[PDB]
């Protein structure tokens, strides 16, 4: 499923993301945009460490979810990576919350540092009623 901008903004707010651990809704939108373009089925294989990034937030199998094929991986979100490919993003949001509870917070994702950190992210929530 490919989300429309404001549709997603409200979807995230309804799931308790607005200000979760100090992260504004605009920052979550910026992250989702740069990671998957608001697409829930997006995946990316990292041939080097044999891990895969899954879903709207492109969450990695080495540390966050279990796909059974990533060597020596852990499952901190305690979810099958399949849960990160559903149209309904509740599970993906629960896991993104788990990620930001770690030492780096929103900085956990390199894309956020590249395309969102120290930038104007207001555009993502403009006119969404959030």
Curated annotation (Swiss-Prot):
Keywords noted in UniProt: Amyloid, Amyloidosis, Antimicrobial, Bacteriolytic enzyme, Disease variant, Disulfide bond, Glycosidase, Hydrolase, Secreted, Signal
Reported disease: Amyloidosis, hereditary systemic 5: A form of hereditary systemic amyloidosis, a disorder characterized by amyloid deposition in multiple tissues resulting in a wide clinical spectrum. AMYLD5 primarily affects the viscera, and the predominant clinical features are renal dysfunction of varying severity, and intra-abdominal bleeding. Inheritance is autosomal dominant.
GO cellular component: azurophil granule lumen; extracellular exosome; extracellular region; extracellular space; specific granule lumen; tertiary granule lumen
Domain C-type lysozyme: 1-130
UniProt subunit comment: Monomer.
GO annotation (BP), single: defense response to Gram-positive bacterium
Full protein name: Lysozyme C
Active site, per annotation: 35, 53
Protein's job: Lysozymes have primarily a bacteriolytic function; those in tissues and body fluids are associated with the monocyte-macrophage system and enhance the activity of immunoagents.
Family the entry assigns: Belongs to the glycosyl hydrolase 22 family.
Subcellular location per the Swiss-Prot or TrEMBL entry: Secreted
Misc. remarks from the entry: Lysozyme C is capable of both hydrolysis and transglycosylation; it also shows a slight esterase activity. It acts rapidly on both peptide-substituted and unsubstituted peptidoglycan, and slowly on chitin oligosaccharides.
Species of origin: Homo sapiens (Human)
PANTHER family tied to this protein: LYSOZYME C
Residues forming coiled coils: none
């Amino acid at each position: 499923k490919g989300f429309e901008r404001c549709e997603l903004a409200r979807t995230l707010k309804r799931l308790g993301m607005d200000g979760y651990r100090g992260i504004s809704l605009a920052n979550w939108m910026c992250l989702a945009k740069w990671e998957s373009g608001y697409n829930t089925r997006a995946t990316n294989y990292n041939a080097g460490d044999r891990s895969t990034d899954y879903g709207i937030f492109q969450i990695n199998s080495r540390y966050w979810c279990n796909d059974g094929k990533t060597p020596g991986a852990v499952n901190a979100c305690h979810l099958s990576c399949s849960a990160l490919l559903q149209d309904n993003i509740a599970d993906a949001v629960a896991c993104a919350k788990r990620v930001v509870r770690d030492p780096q917070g929103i900085r956990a994702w390199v894309a956020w540092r590249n395309r969102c950190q120290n930038r104007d992210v207001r555009q993502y929530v403009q006119g969404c009623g959030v």
